[PDB]
Nucleic acid binder design. Structure first.
Ligand SMILES: [Mg+2]
Lengths: 124, 51, 520, 51, 34, 228, 83, 49, 23, 42, 328, 51
RNA sequence: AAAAUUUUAGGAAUAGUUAAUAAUAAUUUAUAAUUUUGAUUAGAUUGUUUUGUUAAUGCUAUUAGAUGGGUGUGGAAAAAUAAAAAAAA
């Protein structure tokens, strides 16, 4: 019963005829603040105390990614997974945004200050 | 009489099966079941592996 | 026989709502005032959302910024030019009105126009009521009906509350599909039918055990509100915990699947193990979806020319008698194995937000200033609340008469502030401050009725609704035998009728005035 | 139907059926008896006394 | 005194044999080792 | 935990381009069924012993069967209920509408009862009277208990027992006997080759003992007859 | 009289265009004769046929009127669009 | 059962339901294992010596 | 060939009659 | 201080009038009843 | 006896096809003869047969299937109980010109069978839907049956569990109550239907004229436990009507009882000994007229009140879509 | 009952340049046309109609 | 109230049933009745020189518009659209 509503519906059904496109959607991220030498992480693994912004971080999540600033270029490396996420002195299932937390990535990886850890999702 | 009655009932069941029309070919049945002889025979008793 | 003025919750959804009541000039003027206020402040067309309820809507660009929503002046009216382009897209599959951030303003506007229709036609008076209350959004609606908040301000207030809820959900890592609500009925759950008190005790034990068993992961489950004495409890959580709770609330699962004699802890352990087994096997998530739409084809090659352009019959009786593929809730064979299946005791809800949950503590803290800077300063609030003047307002949290100067009410509100959900787990990494508690402490140290009211309003955003206690206090303490509940769909008047009060049971006559005005 | 199957336009009418069939009064009954009305008198053979 | 159980069960039992793998208390495997 | 196996779901692609998705429960066809446990604790099977079908071998169910199920015929209330139900059954048989009965020998029904559509016409009344015969043979000694005069002391003891337990009065006993006599006089007479029972069954009953008992009760009471 | 099956006794039929394509005439004739796909609903049943498109290519037509033909050159079609 | 038929006129001379030909010994040879020899002797057509 | 297929063994073992022990 | 009846020319251009169904028969209530009791609202 | 057909899979496929396409006789015969010849009928097979029987509203066949299932030791389930109750509720009934449609259903205690099925479904732990309760109530309140007391008990337990009332069940129960002369119960049912919002009953709301009156069971219990005084409470007064001395009151009440009995003893000509609710009341399940319903909502999609007459869906000298068409 | 002489009325309503007229008047040898409902300009690159 | 005439490419069983009766309103009796000489159910169709055509006893048409629950009224239901119709000076 509305002209622009009908136009929007027509545009939606015209766009829906195009084939699917894969979009990497990032749910949340954290910015590294300090990095500590962790014994349990491994010789090549370093723990990181960092502040998480724009959403919470799930330790049980599967797909993670690392972003490093090179030069205002942002390169992406280490599509892996979080090994041990702990806040204060106790393990946590998830940490909400704004709260500082300590993260340890798997595969014995170490990251410096300024790194950005991002949890993402692939879907059609 | 028991056997004759059983045969008559089987003939009636064939007449009823005639309702389904022509039967499909082999590959439908062949792909219907992925069961193997192992799962078929384990129901009664587990046979030892050959030596 | 004193009427209790009850307001429906945000759960009600209708395209029509109260469009037919705009024929009265006064109701039309009020509706135009509210719609113009909302359009000038955020470019949102409530009339369009109600009458059309589209799937895609365009509002003012950069009008959904959380910083501006939080720090803007609620009382001040926006003077945005009508030529401002509307480039912000809001899209929902079911409809725009399904979105909470816009559902709340529409529901509040419908309540206001219905009340205005009653007042103009029948001379209905709110002051005749001796107690006023509402479910969730009904609290704000009741305050606006009293007059402490003008409708123009209140529409913006509820829109900002909804926007903060949406921001909290977006900040939550779990997607919108991972947040579901269910209504549980322990009586039909056959959990100690002899004692409904033991039934609700077993329900609480079940949810606590599930929360403890799943505290390692990000799964959560907690009781959100208590609607009926033993017939309706609304709880939210992730699909895994909800399926575990559904399996617990199933006599067959407790009979043959595990035990028939085992303790509640063993039952919960078997339930979570079975849920994990279902995940391993591949049971579909959210199986409560409806069947496939009516099939009409036009490809004669695949189905024949005689079947083209015609709907296929759903069996010999056209679906009148459901088949085994549609009675999955009775045959626990496939698509009904998971606990998410509707079974008349574990009812799904269409709402996709964990209202009154631990996930909304941050939203509550951000929303406290929003109601702090929206109330009148010190005159009308104190006149209304003080000693108290009828109608008395009941709060969702620890439902009691709002008596800010009473030590008993102060202790009840402090217990509500410092309380916790039944299945809540505040481990490390969970947002937790005490801004509302400190605000109420300041409101107890110095009078600050406005600050106390703001704190108690903000608390219910992330604290459970004690509607059972509200009903008990309305019937017994305030001597109410009649309920005038305004709702398009009779959301809570049905529960009011269903529940029985023992005082020889007091008779409660309840009605929806805009819907059954003839009976009034 | 179990007896006859309809697959084309069917003839209608009793005396309009082609080929035509009509009564033929001239027979043994008309040769023997003077019938006051058609079919008043008949001659036949008894084919049952069960009743 | 009590009415007898319906003798029509003979018709149901007619041309029926107890399945080895469909007994109420039959397991897999049918025969267990000692 | 006795988990029920799931159906095998197969998707097949027709050469015309159609798709068929069907779930065949091939697993739960040879494997033994997975029985469930009742919520109440023990499974309660539905009872179907009261339904009336075209089962020729089975007798027609009657309300007297429900009272005979308990077997506590000593109870006076149970005896009264038995008498009321038996009288109702006999009266229903006597006043049955016999418009379209048409009970005649049919050749095709040699090895089975009457046709399914002919149950009410040519089978119902015969089954009803056979059920009446069976119920009477079962409950005659309960409705009309045997009397024993013995000597004078035996008669005194019998009268004392009767006064202690006057379960059924002479009037209602006589009404029951009258309805039974009417049914016996209007019994089914014609036998069929399909009748598996004895041919002597379709004959009127002998109620000499019942007449003696009702006469004993009538003389026991002070005035059984009135000028009305 | 098996011809004109889709006319259903009427001397003409009211059809709607769906597709248009070309077919080779029967040998020894050679060419690309134009034939159109037509759809029509009769007594709540849809029917699809193929008819020779001899109408002039002028206005943008969506419906067509179909009559009988008789030219044995095209195997499968016997219906012709009225001019 | 020929000795105790549950129907009258076991045989018939219709066009599509002739059963007299289906009563000869050749058809009973198939079920000769279950056959009753007295019934075969009394009710059969074209029996051999 | 369909008869030879292994599902026939499943059918046979499923329809195998139970044998009562001698009294 | 009557109602038209729809006509359809069936054969030989002969009109056929579909008069409203009698209010007493069960077919009107059959149409009024819901189609799928489990799914649709009562 | 080809191996393609001598297998449970093909038997189940054909059984499903017959249950979804043909009538109940096909499924019954096929299931019984397969069971006789060697096919084992599991819970799925029995549920398919019961679905077909419930869809066609067969009672005796449902009872026979239940007996066979119990003999074969197949445990029922929620779908089985739902199908049993639905079949018992869909059993055809009524009177057509002083001719009873289904008189065998009188002796086939389908109401009791459905009640036992519902009780078993609740006890075993399955979720009994509202359709089962409505069908169970209909089995009690169909025109040939008068069990309004048990119907009231079932409806009270339904309201306590907060079930939903079907318009058909409400109509049948109201007809039964009016036939059995229960105006108070009929008014209560109408008020409940108006309050719930049943389709067609949104306007049949009436004031309670028995608001202060006690129940008949209450007055009977009071009499069992002065009956002369209790007669005044039993008889309703209009306020402006006042009691008379009890000696004359007893005579007046006896006169009224005699007059009422004499009035109700008079035969009604042409009524065939049937109530007005039982006159011209033939009910069959919707499977009988599904084709009519489908073609009505096609030929007269926008004229629901129009009669579906032939020549709307077929020309002259041509067959119509529905073979049976109106009735048989 | 069948309505003929409808395209004749639609001829007066379809104004502008006729598709067949444009096809006939296009003397360019480079361009190509195909006829489905009108003479649409075929795209050599893809084979579809030239937008 | 009777008799004759009575449709379908792939043809089979039908049934408030037949007769007798001191029986209105059948508690009975019978080896009952229908049908391959084409029944019953289902489809089509207003039955008995009226149209068209031909050398034709062929082929092809046709609104004689006719019937159980709505009132037991009326001599008789057909009684709730119409249809050229004079109904008590
Ligand atoms: Mg004939």
């Amino acid at each position: 019963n509305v002209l622009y509503h009908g136009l929007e519906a027509l545009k939606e059904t015209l766009v829906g005829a195009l084939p699917k496109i894969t979009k990497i959607r990032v749910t949340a991220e954290a910015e590294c603040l300090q990095v500590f030498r962790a014994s349990q992480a491994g010789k090549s693994g370093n723990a990181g105390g960092m502040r998480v912004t724009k959403g919470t971080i799930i330790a049980a999540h599967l797909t993670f990614r690392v972003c490093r600033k090179a030069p205002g270029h942002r390169v992406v490396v280490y599509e892996g997974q979080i090994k041990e996420l702990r806040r204060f002195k106790e393990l946590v299932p998830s940490v909400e945004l704004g709260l500082e937390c300590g993260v340890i990535m798997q595969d014995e990886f170490q990251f410096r200050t300024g790194d950005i850890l991002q949890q993402y999702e692939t879907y059609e | 009489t028991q056997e004759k009655l059983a045969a008559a009932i089987q003939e009636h069941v064939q007449d009823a099966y005639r309702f389904s029309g022509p039967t499909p070919d082999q590959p439908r049945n062949r792909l219907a079941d992925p069961v193997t002889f192992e799962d078929a025979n384990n129901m009664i008793a587990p046979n030892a592996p050959a030596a | 026989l004193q009427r209790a003025l009850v307001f429906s919750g945000q759960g009600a959804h209708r395209r029509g709502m109260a469009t037919e009541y705009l024929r009265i000039p006064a109701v039309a003027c009020l509706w135009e005032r509210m719609k113009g206020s909302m359009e000038q402040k955020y470019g949102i067309s409530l009339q369009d959302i109600i009458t059309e309820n589209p799937t895609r809507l365009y509002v003012y660009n950069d009008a959904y910024d959380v910083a501006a929503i939080c720090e803007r002046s609620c009382q001040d009216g926006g003077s945005v030019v009508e030529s401002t382009p509307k480039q912000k897209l809001i899209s929902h599959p079911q409809g725009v009105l399904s979105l909470t951030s816009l559902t709340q303003p529409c529901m509040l506007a419908a309540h206001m126009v219905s009340l205005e229709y009653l007042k103009e036609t029948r001379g209905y008076s709110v002051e005749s009521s001796e107690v006023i209350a509402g479910h969730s959004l009904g609290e704000f609606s009741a305050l606006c009906a009293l007059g402490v908040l003008s409708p123009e301000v209140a529409i913006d207030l509820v829109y900002r509350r909804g926007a903060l809820m949406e921001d909290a959900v977006k900040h939550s890592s779990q997607s919108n599909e991972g947040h579901l609500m269910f209504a549980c009925n322990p009586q039909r759950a056959k959990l100690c039918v002899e004692d409904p008190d033991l039934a609700v005790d077993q329900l609480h034990i079940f949810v606590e055990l599930i929360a403890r068993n799943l505290s390692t992961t990000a799964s959560f489950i907690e009781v959100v509100n208590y609607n009926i004495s033993y017939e309706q409890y609304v709880v939210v959580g992730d699909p895994i915990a909800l399926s575990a709770l559904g399996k617990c609330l199933d006599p067959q699962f407790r009979a043959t699947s595990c035990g028939s004699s085992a303790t509640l802890d063993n039952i919960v352990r078997t339930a979570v193990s079975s849920v994990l087994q279902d995940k391993q096997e591949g049971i579909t998530m959210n199986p409560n979806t409806g069947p496939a739409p009516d099939f009409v084809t036009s490809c004669a090659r695949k189905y024949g020319i005689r079947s083209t352009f015609r709907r296929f019959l759903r069996g010999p009786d056209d679906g009148y008698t459901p088949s085994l593929e549609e009675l999955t809730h009775l045959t626990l064979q496939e698509d009904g194995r998971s606990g998410l299946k509707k079974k008349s005791w574990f009812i799904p809800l269409p709402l996709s937000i964990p209202f009154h949950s631990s996930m909304l503590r941050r939203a509550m803290d951000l929303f406290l200033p929003v109601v702090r800077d929206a109330l009148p300063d010190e005159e009308t609030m104190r006149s209304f609340f003080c000693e108290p003047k009828k109608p008395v307002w009941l709060t969702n949290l620890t439902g009691t008469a709002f008596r800010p100067f009473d030590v008993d009410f102060q202790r009840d509100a402090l217990d509500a502030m410092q309380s916790m959900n039944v299945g809540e787990i505040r481990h490390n990494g969970r947002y937790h401050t005490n801004l509302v508690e400190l605000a109420f402490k300041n409101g107890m140290d110095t009078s600050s009725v406005r600050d106390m009211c703001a704190a108690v309003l903000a608390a219910q955003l992330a604290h459970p609704v004690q509607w059972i206690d509200v009903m008990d206090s309305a019937v017994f303490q305030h001597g109410v035998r009649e309920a005038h509940e305004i709702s398009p769909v009779r959301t809570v008047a049905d529960m009011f009728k269903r529940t029985v009060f023992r005082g020889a049971a007091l008779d409660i006559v309840t009605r929806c005035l805009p819907s059954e005005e003839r009976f009034l | 139907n179990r007896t006859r199957h309809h697959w084309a336009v069917s003839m209608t009418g009793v005396l309009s059926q082609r080929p035509r069939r009509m009564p033929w009064p001239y027979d043994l009954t008309s040769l023997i008896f003077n019938q006051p009305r058609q079919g008043s008198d008949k001659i036949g053979y008894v084919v049952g006394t069960s009743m | 005194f009590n009415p007898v159980l319906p003798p029509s069960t003979a018709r149901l039992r007619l041309l029926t044999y107890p399945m080895a793998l469909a007994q109420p208390h039959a397991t897999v495997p049918l025969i267990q080792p000692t | 935990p006795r988990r029920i196996p799931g159906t095998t779901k197969v998707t097949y692609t027709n050469k015309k381009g159609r798709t068929f998705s069907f779930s065949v429960p091939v697993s739960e066809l040879t494997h033994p069924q997975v029985t469930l446990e009742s919520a109440a604790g023990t499974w309660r099977e539905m009872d179907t012993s009261f339904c009336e079908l075209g089962d020729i071998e089975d007798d027609m169910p009657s309300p007297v069967d429900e009272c005979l199920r308990g077997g506590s015929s000593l109870d006076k209330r149970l005896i009264q209920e038995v008498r009321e139900r038996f009288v109702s059954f006999c009266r229903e048989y006597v006043l049955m509408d016999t418009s379209g009965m048409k009970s005649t020998i049919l050749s095709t029904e040699l090895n089975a009862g009457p046709d399914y559509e002919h149950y009410d016409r040519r089978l119902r009344r015969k089954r009803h009277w056979l059920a009446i015969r069976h119920r009477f043979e079962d409950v005659r000694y309960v409705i009309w208990p045997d009397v024993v005069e013995e000597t004078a002391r035996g008669d005194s003891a019998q009268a004392d027992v009767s006064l202690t337990n006057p379960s059924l009065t002479a009037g209602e006993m006589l009404e029951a006997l009258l309805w039974l006599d009417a049914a016996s006089t209007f019994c089914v007479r014609k036998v069929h080759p399909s009748d598996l029972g004895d041919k002597s069954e379709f004959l009127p009953l002998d109620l000499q003992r019942e007449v003696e008992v009702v006469a004993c009760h009538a003389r026991r009471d002070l005035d059984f007859f009135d000028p009305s | 009289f098996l011809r004109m099956w889709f006319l259903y006794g009427c001397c003409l039929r009211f059809v709607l265009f769906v597709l248009c394509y070309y077919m080779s005439p029967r040998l020894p004739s050679s060419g690309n004769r134009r034939v159109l796909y037509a759809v029509f609903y009769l007594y709540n049943f849809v029917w699809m046929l193929r008819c020779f498109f001899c109408c002039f290519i002028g206005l943008v037509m969506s419906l067509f009127i179909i009559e009988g033909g008789g030219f044995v050159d095209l195997p499968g079609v016997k219906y012709y669009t009225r001019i | 059962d020929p000795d105790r038929p549950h129907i009258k006129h076991i045989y018939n001379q219709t066009a599509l339901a002739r059963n007299l030909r289906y009563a000869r010994y050749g058809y009973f040879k198939r079920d000769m294992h279950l056959l009753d020899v007295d019934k075969l002797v009394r009710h059969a057509r074209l029996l051999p010596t | 060939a369909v008869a030879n297929l292994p599902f026939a063994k499943m059918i046979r073992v499923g329809m195998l009659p139970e044998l009562k022990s001698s009294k | 201080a009557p109602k038209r009846v729809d006509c359809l020319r069936i054969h030989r251009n002969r009109p056929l009038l579909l008069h409203p169904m009698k209010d007493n028969n069960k077919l009107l209530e059959l149409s009024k009843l819901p189609a799928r009791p489990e799914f649709d609202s009562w | 006896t080809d191996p393609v057909r001598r297998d449970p899979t093909e038997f189940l496929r054909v059984l499903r096809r017959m249950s979804r396409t043909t009538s109940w006789q096909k499924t019954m015969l096929f299931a019984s003869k397969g069971r006789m010849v060697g096919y084992r009928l599991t819970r799925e097979h029995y549920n398919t047969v019961l679905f077909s029987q419930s869809l066609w509203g067969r009672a005796l066949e449902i009872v026979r299937v239940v007996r066979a299932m119990q003999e074969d030791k197949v445990q029922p389930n929620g779908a089985t109980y739902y199908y049993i109750v639905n079949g018992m509720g869909n059993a055809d009934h009524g009177w057509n010109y002083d001719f009873r449609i289904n008189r065998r259903l009188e002796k086939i205690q389908h109401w009791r069978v459905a009640l036992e099925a519902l009780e078993a479904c609740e006890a075993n732990g399955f979720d009994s839907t509202d359709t089962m309760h409505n069908s169970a109530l209909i089995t009690l309140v169909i025109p040939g049956f008068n069990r309004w007391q048990q119907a009231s008990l079932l409806l009270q337990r339904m309201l306590r569990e907060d079930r939903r009332m079907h318009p058909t069940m409400v109509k049948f129960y109201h007809d039964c109550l009016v036939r059995n002369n229960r105006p108070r119960e009929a008014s209560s049912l109408m008020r409940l239907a108006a309050e719930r919002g049943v389709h067609g009953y949104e306007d049949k709301w009436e004031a309670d004229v028995y608001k202060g009156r006690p129940l008949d069971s209450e007055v009977m219990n009071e009499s069992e436990g002065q009956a002369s005084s209790l007669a005044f409470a039993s008889l309703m007064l209009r306020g402006d009507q006042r009691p008379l001395p009890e000696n004359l009151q007893a005579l007046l009440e006896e006169e009224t009882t005699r007059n009422i009995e004499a009035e109700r003893s008079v035969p009604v000509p042409f009524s065939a000994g049937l109530h007005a609710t039982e006159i011209n009341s033939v009910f069959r399940p919707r499977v009988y007229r599904q084709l009519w319903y489908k073609w009505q909502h096609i030929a007269n999609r926008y004229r629901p009140t129009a009669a579906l007459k032939r020549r709307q869906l077929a020309p002259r000298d041509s067959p119509t879509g529905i073979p049976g068409f109106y009735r048989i | 009952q069948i309505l003929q002489k409808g395209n004749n009325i639609l001829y007066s309503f379809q104004w502008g340049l006729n598709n067949g007229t444009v096809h006939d008047l296009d003397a360019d040898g480079g361009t190509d046309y195909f006829m489905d409902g009108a003479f649409h300009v075929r795209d050599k690159e893809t084979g579809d109609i030239d937008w």
